[PDB]
Design an enzyme around this catalytic site. Structure first.
Site, PDB file in Angstrom:
ATOM      1  N   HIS A   1      -4.796   7.609  -3.494  1.00 51.13           N
ATOM      2  CA  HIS A   1      -3.722   7.130  -2.919  1.00 51.13           C
ATOM      3  C   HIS A   1      -2.789   7.547  -1.569  1.00 51.13           C
ATOM      4  O   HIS A   1      -3.058   7.520  -0.624  1.00 51.13           O
ATOM      5  CB  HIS A   1      -2.761   6.289  -3.915  1.00 51.13           C
ATOM      6  CG  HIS A   1      -1.643   5.351  -3.600  1.00 51.13           C
ATOM      7  ND1 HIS A   1      -1.287   5.377  -2.493  1.00 51.13           N
ATOM      8  CD2 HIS A   1      -1.213   4.113  -3.938  1.00 51.13           C
ATOM      9  CE1 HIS A   1      -0.159   4.484  -2.038  1.00 51.13           C
ATOM     10  NE2 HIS A   1      -0.288   3.779  -3.098  1.00 51.13           N
TER      11      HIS A   1
ATOM     12  N   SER B   1      -1.721   0.758   3.133  1.00 53.30           N
ATOM     13  CA  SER B   1      -0.539   0.659   2.133  1.00 53.30           C
ATOM     14  C   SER B   1      -0.142  -0.689   1.987  1.00 53.30           C
ATOM     15  O   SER B   1      -1.079  -1.800   1.801  1.00 53.30           O
ATOM     16  CB  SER B   1       0.477   1.403   2.407  1.00 53.30           C
ATOM     17  OG  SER B   1       1.325   1.523   1.475  1.00 53.30           O
ATOM     18  N   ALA B   2       0.932  -1.166   1.305  1.00 50.57           N
ATOM     19  CA  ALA B   2       1.490  -2.175   1.103  1.00 50.57           C
ATOM     20  C   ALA B   2       1.402  -3.111   2.494  1.00 50.57           C
ATOM     21  O   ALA B   2       1.326  -4.430   2.237  1.00 50.57           O
ATOM     22  CB  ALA B   2       3.065  -2.287   0.744  1.00 50.57           C
TER      23      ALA B   2
ATOM     24  N   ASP C   1      -7.346  -0.532   0.917  1.00 51.03           N
ATOM     25  CA  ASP C   1      -6.333  -0.483  -0.395  1.00 51.03           C
ATOM     26  C   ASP C   1      -5.142  -1.771  -0.289  1.00 51.03           C
ATOM     27  O   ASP C   1      -4.320  -1.542   0.310  1.00 51.03           O
ATOM     28  CB  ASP C   1      -5.760   0.866  -0.696  1.00 51.03           C
ATOM     29  CG  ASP C   1      -6.897   1.992  -0.810  1.00 51.03           C
ATOM     30  OD1 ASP C   1      -7.068   2.020  -2.199  1.00 51.03           O
ATOM     31  OD2 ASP C   1      -7.461   2.471  -0.037  1.00 51.03           O
TER      32      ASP C   1
END
Lengths: 267, 267
Positions: free
Chosen positions: A245, A128-129, A155
């Site tokens: 996602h 993730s982030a 990602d």
């Protein structure tokens, strides 16, 4: 219940997410922040003791649903191949203080591993982030006096690049609100809107170690042409995965675990 | 064991409460609202019936520990003289939405006042910020065919006039944290910011209704010259009552009771 969990979903339905974030960070002045002078301490998680000569580490991002309650997924897929350490974030459980500034916090979890490890090789594997922080940790580790072995990102969307995609997904995070293994009470939110101000001032540096991405599959919608997919400003090698996602790792943890087996055998 | 409790506490030790409010109103803008074109009501808290000719409608406050529960003390004082019909401010207890402005809250509370009443005269009253709400309810009723006999503005602090005075009180309230009657829940602290911006840009209107302001006896502490206590522009008789801005009602209820009767005896 709570009062903030209400506005969280009422923002995504109309389209006023950006203005909401400017509000959150406004409360990040009233606590007891630490620095490299006082005193803190954490206790690692007990998980797996599987075989291997090269162990792997992992962590979590910022997107609320994060935690040491969902990585038990990849835990089963990786068993047999190599061990897996569990490094928890300092804050998600009653009785903890918050950071002071970007390049300050890193002087905490640095000393902890330099006491338990010993002389075993390792690698990272975030999501993730948080795929930003996993990169930052490896930097201070490089010149202190103990270089890693190789990272494997999953990602990402770093600053100073694509001004569109970013905030466009957060709008969706509020609309796609299906249940999580843990309740969302008045503590797991004030941290999310806190790192937003931090991630907006950072800008990557040029290093020289082996990178490896693991892209996604079927797009959320009937998206046009080439207007997505990660593209870091440096140099690396890539490998895909089938999925999307918000879920991926959950119901697709076996896949990635095999994409990494072929990597560690060369480079 | 919430989080918005200590965040309100530590803000008083430092000295910053203003910027803390800009946000409370930002979060409330997301909660469901009522402006006049939607269903919602509020049962007037039955205090104590009895003798009388001009019942005292005592609206609730606007603080964190406000509500018709505080007026329990004054309810026992007016036993024989005049009853109390304490109007509950919405948004504080679980379930109730928040308004758009001042003309959104004072309206909904006006409906309950005429309903239970009828051909029976009444005199609205409040306390400081709650007095801003009480006056708004009394003024809205002015030309609406039911102008109340008068009002009793207890220690009211009019915005736009008392800049440093009213703001210094909020800074004091934070350091006055000490066991409240009703637990300071999360939904109460959010409603604070909601009403803050409502009564914020709210300038009261003129009327021909008699007003009885009730000021304090001892200041909140060492004060140089005459620059404390509540004020008001229009023509009104003024009378003092002991205790600082916080104990002139919670620990001095009766002292005020004898003050409104001598007023009702005239006209």
């Amino acid at each position: 219940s709570s009062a903030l969990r209400d506005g969280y979903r009422q923002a995504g339905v109309s389209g006023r997410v950006r203005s909401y974030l400017d509000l959150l960070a406004g409360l990040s002045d009233f606590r007891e922040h630490f620095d490299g002078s006082d005193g803190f301490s954490l206790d690692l998680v007990d998980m797996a003791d599987g075989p291997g000569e090269v162990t792997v580490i992992c962590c979590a991002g910022t997107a609320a649903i994060s935690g040491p309650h969902e990585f038990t997924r990849l835990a089963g897929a990786l068993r047999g191949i190599a061990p897996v350490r569990a490094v928890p974030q300092p804050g998600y459980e009653e009785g903890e203080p918050l950071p002071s500034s970007m390049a300050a916090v890193a002087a905490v979890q640095a000393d902890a591993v330099i006491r338990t490890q010993g002389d075993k090789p390792f690698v990272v594997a975030g999501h993730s982030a948080g795929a930003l922080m996993a990169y930052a940790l490896a930097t201070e580790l490089l010149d202190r006096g103990h270089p890693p072995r190789g990272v494997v990102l999953i990602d990402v969307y770093p600053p100073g690049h694509q001004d569109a995609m970013n905030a466009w997904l957060e709008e969706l995070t509020a609309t796609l609100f299906d249940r999580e293994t843990v309740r969302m009470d008045d503590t797991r939110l004030t941290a999310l809107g806190a790192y937003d101000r931090l991630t907006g001032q950072w800008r990557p540096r040029e290093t020289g170690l082996p990178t490896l991405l693991v892209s996604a599959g079927e797009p959320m919608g009937p998206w046009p042409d080439d207007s997505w997919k990660p593209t870091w400003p440096f140099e690396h090698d890539t490998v895909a995965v089938p999925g999307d996602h918000f879920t991926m790792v959950q119901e697709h943890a076996d896949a990635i675990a095999r994409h990494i087996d072929a990597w560690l055998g060369g480079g």
